[PDB]
Amino acid sequence: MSLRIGVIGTGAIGKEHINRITNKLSGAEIVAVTDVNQEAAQKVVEQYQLNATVYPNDDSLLADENVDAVLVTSWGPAHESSVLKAIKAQKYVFCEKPLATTAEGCMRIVEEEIKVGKRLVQVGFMRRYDSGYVQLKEALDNHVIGEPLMIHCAHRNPTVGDNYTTDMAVVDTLVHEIDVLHWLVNDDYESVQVIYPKKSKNALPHLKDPQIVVIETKGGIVINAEIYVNCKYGYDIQCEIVGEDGIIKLPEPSSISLRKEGRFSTDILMDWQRRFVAAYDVEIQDFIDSIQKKGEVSGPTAWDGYIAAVTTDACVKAQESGQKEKVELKEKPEFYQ
Amino acid sequence: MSLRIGVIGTGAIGKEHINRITNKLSGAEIVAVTDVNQEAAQKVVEQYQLNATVYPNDDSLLADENVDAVLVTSWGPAHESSVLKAIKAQKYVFCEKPLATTAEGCMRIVEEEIKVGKRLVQVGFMRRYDSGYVQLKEALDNHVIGEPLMIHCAHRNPTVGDNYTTDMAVVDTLVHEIDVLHWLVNDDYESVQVIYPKKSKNALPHLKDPQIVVIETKGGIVINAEIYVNCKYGYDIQCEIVGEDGIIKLPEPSSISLRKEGRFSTDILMDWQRRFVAAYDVEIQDFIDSIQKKGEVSGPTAWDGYIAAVTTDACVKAQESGQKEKVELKEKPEFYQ
Amino acid sequence: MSLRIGVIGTGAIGKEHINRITNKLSGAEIVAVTDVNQEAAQKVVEQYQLNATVYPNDDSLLADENVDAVLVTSWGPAHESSVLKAIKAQKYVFCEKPLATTAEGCMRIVEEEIKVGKRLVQVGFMRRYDSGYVQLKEALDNHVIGEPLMIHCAHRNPTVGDNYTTDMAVVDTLVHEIDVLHWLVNDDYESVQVIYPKKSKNALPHLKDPQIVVIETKGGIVINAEIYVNCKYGYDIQCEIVGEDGIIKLPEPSSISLRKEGRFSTDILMDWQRRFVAAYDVEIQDFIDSIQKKGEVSGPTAWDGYIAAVTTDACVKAQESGQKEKVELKEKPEFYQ
Amino acid sequence: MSLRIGVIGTGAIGKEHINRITNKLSGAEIVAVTDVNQEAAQKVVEQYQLNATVYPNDDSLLADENVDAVLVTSWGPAHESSVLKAIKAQKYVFCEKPLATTAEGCMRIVEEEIKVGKRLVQVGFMRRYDSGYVQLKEALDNHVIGEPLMIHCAHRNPTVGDNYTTDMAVVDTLVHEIDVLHWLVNDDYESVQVIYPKKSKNALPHLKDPQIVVIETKGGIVINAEIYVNCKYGYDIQCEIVGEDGIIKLPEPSSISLRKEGRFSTDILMDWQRRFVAAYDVEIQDFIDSIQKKGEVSGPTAWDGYIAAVTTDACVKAQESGQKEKVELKEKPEFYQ
Ligand SMILES: NC(=O)C1=CN([C@@H]2O[C@H](COP(=O)(O)OP(=O)(O)OC[C@H]3O[C@@H](n4cnc5c(N)ncnc54)[C@H](O)[C@@H]3O)[C@@H](O)[C@H]2O)C=CC1
Ligand SMILES: NC(=O)C1=CN([C@@H]2O[C@H](COP(=O)(O)OP(=O)(O)OC[C@H]3O[C@@H](n4cnc5c(N)ncnc54)[C@H](O)[C@@H]3O)[C@@H](O)[C@H]2O)C=CC1
Ligand SMILES: NC(=O)C1=CN([C@@H]2O[C@H](COP(=O)(O)OP(=O)(O)OC[C@H]3O[C@@H](n4cnc5c(N)ncnc54)[C@H](O)[C@@H]3O)[C@@H](O)[C@H]2O)C=CC1
Ligand SMILES: NC(=O)C1=CN([C@@H]2O[C@H](COP(=O)(O)OP(=O)(O)OC[C@H]3O[C@@H](n4cnc5c(N)ncnc54)[C@H](O)[C@@H]3O)[C@@H](O)[C@H]2O)C=CC1
Ligand SMILES: O[C@H]1[C@H](O)[C@@H](O)[C@H](O)[C@@H](O)[C@H]1O
Ligand SMILES: O[C@H]1[C@H](O)[C@@H](O)[C@H](O)[C@@H](O)[C@H]1O
Ligand SMILES: O[C@H]1[C@H](O)[C@@H](O)[C@H](O)[C@@H](O)[C@H]1O
Ligand SMILES: O[C@H]1[C@H](O)[C@@H](O)[C@H](O)[C@@H](O)[C@H]1O
Incomplete structure (x- = not known):
């Protein structure tokens, strides 16, 4: 009983995720792709000999009763929208960075999820699955x-x-x-x-x-x-x-x-692609396995994607300022610990 | 259309292969297990909530029309037999070391495969898939x-x-x-x-x-x-x-x-298990993918398993001897290059 | 014929310089000493079997004509005084850091040296002589x-x-x-x-x-x-x-x-005294050789000592003010390049 | 008062030992030299500004009473001769390898030294003084x-x-x-x-x-x-x-x-001459210090030189015979521990 996933954005990184879910990972299949370039997505489907359906927009894809979860892997801007929709259509969402381009956009998404009672949103910050970073975490948790x-x-x-x-x-x-x-x-x-x-x-x-x-x-x-x-x-x-x-x-x-x-x-790598290939696989698999075994997601939360948007803002502010900008965060909601 | 595999020997390493094929890899499922301890295998089936069938012997399992390939992962001795049978029943075989305990046993297996026209036997020497050893190979092929x-x-x-x-x-x-x-x-x-x-x-x-x-x-x-x-x-x-x-x-x-x-x-590892975990996954996946895409296997050939048996014999001879024992090899058959 | 050296300040570091000059390096000897604890100076002479005069102060020692170079290795705040005297007595001086506790103190010493025409002052910044730092320098100088x-x-x-x-x-x-x-x-x-x-x-x-x-x-x-x-x-x-x-x-x-x-x-060193033992040896040997083979000191200069003093002050400022302080240096007198 | 050293053999290595003893180390000087190319010996003395006598041979040089220790650094096969003479003249001798080209040659030198009561011969196996090898030794000696x-x-x-x-x-x-x-x-x-x-x-x-x-x-x-x-x-x-x-x-x-x-x-070194420059310095400095502070040489002994010679012979045997040769050593005379 494989998890049925729909991909919103057959981008270059959406092409990767489709391929690993198809030919490397376990217990899931891509059944729906939608791209702003409906001829670009239609090529990605014949490519990996998929058995999916092409949609003009996310609404029509999210309206499909096959799809249980979605990969939001299109332009950064076109995320916040696709995400909020998915939360409302009550599908599981794996969202590649950014969660949303605006620190407030990530704030809307938080509120929606807090309603749906459980966790649907997982943000694609793969470094957390990298064994290097994992060993660090391990060492720190051990004091x-x-x-x-x-x-x-x-x-x-x-x-x-x-x-x-x-x-x-x-x-x-x-x-x-x-x-x-x-x-x-x-x-x-x-x-x-x-x-x-x-x-x-x-x-x-x-x-x-x-x-x-x-x-x-x-x-x-x-x-x-x-x-x-x-x-x-x-x-x-x-x-x-x-x-x-x-x-x-x-x-x-x-x-x-x-x-x-x-x-x-x-040897020193020359391509950011090669550096974290393993982290993606572990990442998506956790998404799948977490959904099938627990009925929810587990990775980087939507709150974290918001912590990203805030901090990543104070930084762009200090880029012009040249001063010690401030990072202000709304208190962490009970929902997240 | 997943490759249907049957496991001969629900050993400790056969328990690993079952789990990775089930919960980590792509495009295959375990549908048949046979163990000399029919109560041991029957536990492995409820364990990984498999949807398989338990057989008293390999013959009954090899006689099953579901199974396309077999994992020979029981005692070293009980390999040569299970293998030759599989070649005759015309199933694909992934055989964990040893191919056969006797340098002549591996010689029988070679002859059988040479008849079946194509390659069915892949020996489980995983180091060849380890990225370390791969990089070495890469460097050498480049002079x-x-x-x-x-x-x-x-x-x-x-x-x-x-x-x-x-x-x-x-x-x-x-x-x-x-x-x-x-x-x-x-x-x-x-x-x-x-x-x-x-x-x-x-x-x-x-x-x-x-x-x-x-x-x-x-x-x-x-x-x-x-x-x-x-x-x-x-x-x-x-x-x-x-x-x-x-x-x-x-x-x-x-x-x-x-x-x-x-x-x-x-840090230095303490468990041989941890050292090559990735090599197994790449290994089995190559077995699967190679079968579905090419109609044959690709890994370490049966000839190599024989080269193993010969050399690994001259060594046991020099263990008592104390002299420069000789390694004699029958010429490589055209079938293998 | 060896360089005859007088040591002002016979403490822990003065003793190490006395020891290396006496039992490790080449082309020099200690002929005069003086310490605030005159008794302690007398013991050093016995301890190291020196053929040296034990003066009551730096004026007396600098008065001795058979000494032609001095090591200023006394209590930090005392350094400045002896260095000025040594310059006016027209002797060569190796001064451990600090050259002086104040930027002004350093300026007085620079201004005195520029008079006497040549370089007499070398400051004991030994890192410049460490083989590692020497290599970094070579690489940078080679672009x-x-x-x-x-x-x-x-x-x-x-x-x-x-x-x-x-x-x-x-x-x-x-x-x-x-x-x-x-x-x-x-x-x-x-x-x-x-x-x-x-x-x-x-x-x-x-x-x-x-x-x-x-x-x-x-x-x-x-x-x-x-x-x-x-x-x-x-x-x-x-x-x-x-x-x-x-x-x-x-x-x-x-x-x-x-x-x-x-x-x-x-292994990681625990004792700072083992880290640069070779740089000290090369540093002092260079003070010696550079004099008998150039007629002037070579290493870090009185001006470098000044730079250090200013920057040090700027840091103590930035420390207690948590501000971004400026480092204002007087123009580098061409006497120094 | 310094150790007065005569150098037999003023070639490339003899010159380096002359240079370090003259411009780097402490507590010794070169007072006598001699070379098969007597003209070349005369140049060394000028080159290094020595205050030394230029003898026509080792007998003459060993006859000089104001020399109390000698460096045997001549053409390999000549070593043995000078070492024997030096022992009978009762002088301290530092002999570069080989001590002698034959096991017999070494035995003659051991047997001569055992007579003269104490250790006069130190062999120039400098690796024992390298900081790396010293550390290995410390670890082993600490189990x-x-x-x-x-x-x-x-x-x-x-x-x-x-x-x-x-x-x-x-x-x-x-x-x-x-x-x-x-x-x-x-x-x-x-x-x-x-x-x-x-x-x-x-x-x-x-x-x-x-x-x-x-x-x-x-x-x-x-x-x-x-x-x-x-x-x-x-x-x-x-x-x-x-x-x-x-x-x-x-x-x-x-x-x-x-x-x-x-x-x-x-980086990897290209010139063998840079690899052990520090071990040579420590080696010679130990020859010096150990004499003026113990009345006998300390480093590798005439017996060690013998061991080397025997093993070397055994290797040249095993070389041309492709056999497993034996290494037969005479009993270690207690004079050596
Ligand atoms: N974490 C990581 O290392 C990486 C992740 N990414 C992220 O992935 C996203 C895009 O990936 P890239 O391949 O780099 O760019 P991309 O431009 O190739 O992907 C965007 C694609 O999706 C389509 N698209 C855009 N908006 C859409 C919408 N609303 N609905 C359906 N389709 C839409 C476009 O036609 C375009 O082809 C970006 O947010 C980027 O930040 C990018 C590279 C690496
Ligand atoms: N390459 C590697 O690193 C590793 C591979 N192995 C290999 O795997 C094989 C066994 O694995 P292990 O778990 O170590 O031992 P194991 O003893 O646990 O596996 C043997 C199991 O298979 C069953 N069995 C034995 N003969 C059989 C037959 N003819 N038909 C059906 N079932 C049978 C037995 O009941 C036993 O439980 C050995 O050949 C061993 O060399 C073992 C460890 C690691
Ligand atoms: N550049 C470098 O790498 C190093 C420099 N130093 C500095 O050098 C100085 C010496 O350090 P230590 O030898 O450890 O000092 P120390 O505290 O062990 O003893 C210094 C000695 O100098 C004597 N002394 C003080 N004022 C004197 C004066 N006006 N005339 C003659 N003698 C006087 C004292 O009686 C004392 O015995 C310190 O200020 C230290 O900060 C210290 C270590 C390394
Ligand atoms: N233990 C060690 O680490 C090292 C030892 N050696 C050995 O030491 C010896 C010297 O090497 P090099 O200085 O490079 O030799 P070299 O070939 O550069 O010159 C040796 C000099 O000794 C002179 N000589 C030869 N026979 C003599 C005699 N009976 N009396 C006086 N002088 C004589 C020659 O005229 C020549 O000028 C060699 O046999 C070499 O194998 C060489 C390098 C290192
Ligand atoms: O997708 C990658 C990744 O996000 C890295 O963090 C970034 O440094 C690379 O430049 C980018 O291409
Ligand atoms: O299965 C492993 C593996 O075969 C290693 O090569 C061996 O050294 C280990 O001891 C064994 O447990
Ligand atoms: O004299 C040394 C030196 O100044 C080092 O910079 C310092 O870190 C050591 O602790 C000190 O003892
Ligand atoms: O004298 C040295 C030394 O004997 C080294 O062992 C050898 O490898 C060098 O090549 C040689 O020049």
Whole structure:
């Protein structure tokens, strides 16, 4: 009895999710796809020899009685809408970042779910399923290094397109950090300062690259997060956590050592795609399994997607300001703990 | 249209394969299990809420028209039989090591398959699917380090039971090495010497632990393989390959670094189970996908399982001998390249 | 014929310099000493079998004509006095940090040296002589990573004394990073800013530990240095330089690796005195050789000492004001390049 | 008052020892020299501004009473002669390897020293003074890993000369491992065995490269050492000791890490002369200090030199016979412990 899923947005990342659910994972199938380009979606269907149905809009897809859950994997803007609809049609929703582009949009979604009595919304922040980040979580829950104090993390890309803009650095990129970091330390943020180092020769005129983002939490944990998307050497994600009595750090992605031409080296990835492939699979499978076994979702909540929208706003504010912007959060609803 | 698989031997490792095919992988289901303990198998069926059928023997299971393929995952001895039967009943067979306990048993199986026109037998040497070993293969096929010359590998266990015996070191353990090594370098062995170092205090009286196994191939590649199954510190698999112009080495299993009490450390596994979990999943999935897409299997051939049986014999011979035993191989049949 | 050296201040560090100059290095000897505790000076001479005069003060010792260079290694606040005297006596001087406790104190010393025509003052910033830091310098000077953009570094101690106070973290501790960083990147500081994270249980109540000091050069390089003098795990110096096209990082001190009880570890030093023992040796040997083979000192200059003093002051400001303070330096007199 | 040292053999290595004793170390000077090329000896004295007598031979130089210790650093085969003379002249002698080219040559030197009552001979096996090897020793002496059982080690050169021949791999190259290994584990060798892998394209036709030398101590420790003098990638010394309850390994030389163009690398040395520069310095300084503070040399002994010679012979046997040769040592005269 496989979970029947409908995909809203046959994008490039929606093409991935369709393929893994189809050819890698267990206990689910894609039966409905809807795309703004109805000829683009119609190609994705013959591609993976799917046995699905193409809809012009989400309404018609959500109206289908086959679909039990939906993958909201289209443009960032077109999320908040598709989501609220799904909650009302009472389907399960896996929503890829962002939950909603506006901190208030995520607030509407919260209220809706709080009504439906249970949890339908899971946000696609995959890092939480990555074994690296999991080991960190494990170590922290065990008090291995006592109380966390500071966190040094980086997030680097070989290069970007002419479409990448200063705000995208804290919106499409630093977003995962913002998500997983607070999950790990179990703390809410508070302030976000932004500091622009000497600009890189690799970055385009309209872009501010690199950037540094300091972030304090209510507890007093200080996080400086480097964001450099034109580093050139590769795609690299670093995270070190200094504690009271010890330090734990995120591993490098497994590689074979090589001794040649006077150097002892490992390999650095070049494609953000390769870095977290395993995390997606574990992610979706948890979505499926959680629905079939518990009648609800389990991953990153809709509240977290809102914590994302707030924080990711104070950051874009400090990008122009240059001052210690504030992060203000509505109290956590009982519904979520 | 999922591949319908029958499991011969609801062992501990047969319990794993059933669970992954059921709850992790894609496009297949277990519909038949047979165990020598018909009450043991009957528990495995209610366990994973399977919708299968229990058979007293393989004949009755192989006679079932549901099953398309079989997992031969019972005692080592009870393999050769179950396999030859499956080849004759014309089912697909995934056979966990050993292919057959006797170098001639594997020879019977080869001949049968050579008749059935295509490939039905895939041997469960999972290391070939491990990304570490894959990266090595990749590097070698690219001539990164020119011509291989020597190989230094180790294989260590924290401890063993009173059931582990001197021959098991080269039969149940060094077997994977023997398999993957020749696959990597694309060469046939030739001689196997065995050298017993000072015996460990951790090993039991009847056991010779550790052991070292030198192995030459027709090309002139020298392999010294440490085998120490009472190392105590953990479960560790090492493999370094010296070439003409460089050296490549197998990575450690990903872990988080820790700075505490004057030491900078990573974690060493304690359970052989954890080391290759991913390799099994990729393995079985390849079995399934290969059958559905190509009408045959793809993994480690039955010939390789025979190359295993021969080599793993010369080793047990050098264990008593103390001399440079010989490895004699019947020419490779056209069927296999 | 060896360089005849007088030591002002025969404490713990003065004794170590006396010992290395006497039993390890080459081309120099101690002919004169003097300490505030004149009795303690007399013991040193016996302890080390010196052939030296024991003067009552620095004026007397500097008066001795058979001494041609002096080591100022006394109580911090006393340094400034002896250095001025030594310059006017026209002797070579190696002064441990601080050169002087105030920016003014340093200016008086610079202005005195510029008179005497050549370099007589070398400041004991030994990190410049450490093999790791030397390598970083070589890479940067070879444009290996293009233009430096950011710097992440840490300075950690297992614990401190009851006497250790909040301001000491920037005046005694961070002072080495302050010197080496701008030396490495050849850029002057423009601003500093202190950020306090959650206090550590390991730090006594009066001490503010850890700290985070953010510093910007004029060129736009953004440094962020972590000071944690109660980290427990050990004594640790980390430094990472992120450039345009690549990243370079300071090495760990050499250690054998251990595989035992589940961990794969290396050692971490506990005693700060073992970390740079080789840099001190090279530092002093350079003071000697550079004199007998150039007629002037070579290492860190009186001006560098001034830079340190100013920046140190700016940090103590930023400390107690939680503000972004400016680092205002007088024009670098061409006498220094 | 310094130790007055005469240098027999003023070649490349004799010059380096002359240089360190003159411009780096402490408590000694060169007062006499002599070379087969007497003209070359005269140049050294000018080159290094020595205050030394230039004798025509070792007899003359040993006759000089104002010299009290000598460095034998001449053409290998000449060593034995000078060492015997020096002993009978009752001077302290530091002899570079070999102590003598034959086991008999070494015996004559041992038998001469046992007469003169105390230790005058220290052999230049500098590895014992390397900080890495010193750490391994400390761990073993502290039973950190229990009883040593096996040893894997490698000795690699980028390339060699046209003059380098097959036997040199065990007499010149493997001779350092031969000395340090039995020193580390405090056990005597019992047998050796050579195994040749596929020749390397980098090795000229006349040379047999790489090689594998298997050695067993009396206690049962099984060493296996790889010699590859044409590895191309660099100069590399690796050593791993597998004990009962754990494993310890020699560190890489210190290097900064680099993240660039897809690789995460450290540096590998090319020049063998940079690998042990610190061990030489400590080695000679110990020859000096140990004399003026004990009245006898301390390091590797004439007996150790004998052990080396015997084992070296056994290897050249095992080389050309492809046999498992025995290592027969005379009883260790109690004069040596
Ligand atoms: N977490 C991660 O690492 C990644 C997730 N994403 C996220 O996924 C979303 C889109 O993925 P991408 O492939 O990168 O972009 P995409 O542009 O290829 O996906 C958008 C596609 O969906 C369709 N679409 C847009 N709005 C729609 C609507 N209201 N209804 C139906 N179809 C609609 C469009 O035709 C377009 O082809 C974005 O929100 C992005 O932030 C993107 C890349 C990676
Ligand atoms: N590659 C790997 O890492 C691993 C594979 N294995 C292999 O799997 C096989 C058994 O797995 P284990 O769980 O370790 O042992 P196991 O003893 O638990 O499995 C044997 C089970 O199958 C049943 N059985 C035996 N012969 C049978 C037959 N002819 N027909 C039906 N059922 C039969 C027995 O009742 C027993 O419960 C062995 O060949 C072993 O070498 C074992 C462990 C790991
Ligand atoms: N740059 C560097 O890496 C290092 C520099 N230092 C600094 O150097 C100074 C010396 O440190 P320690 O030797 O540990 O000091 P210490 O406290 O162990 O003893 C200093 C000695 O100098 C004597 N002294 C004080 N004032 C004097 C004067 N006007 N004339 C002559 N002698 C005088 C005192 O009697 C005392 O015996 C300290 O200020 C310290 O901060 C310390 C360690 C390293
Ligand atoms: N234990 C160790 O780590 C090392 C030891 N050695 C060994 O030490 C020896 C010296 O090497 P190099 O200095 O490179 O030699 P070299 O070839 O550069 O020159 C040796 C010099 O000694 C002179 N000489 C030869 N016979 C002599 C005699 N009977 N009396 C006085 N002088 C004589 C020669 O004229 C020549 O100038 C070699 O045999 C070498 O194998 C070499 C390097 C390191
Ligand atoms: O989808 C990925 C991912 O979100 C990473 O966090 C980001 O750095 C990559 O640039 C992006 O392409
Ligand atoms: O099943 C595993 C595996 O075959 C390993 O190769 C072996 O070393 C382990 O001991 C065994 O339990
Ligand atoms: O003298 C040293 C040095 O100043 C180091 O920078 C400091 O961290 C050590 O604790 C101190 O003892
Ligand atoms: O003198 C050294 C030393 O003997 C090393 O063992 C050898 O590998 C070097 O190549 C040689 O130059």
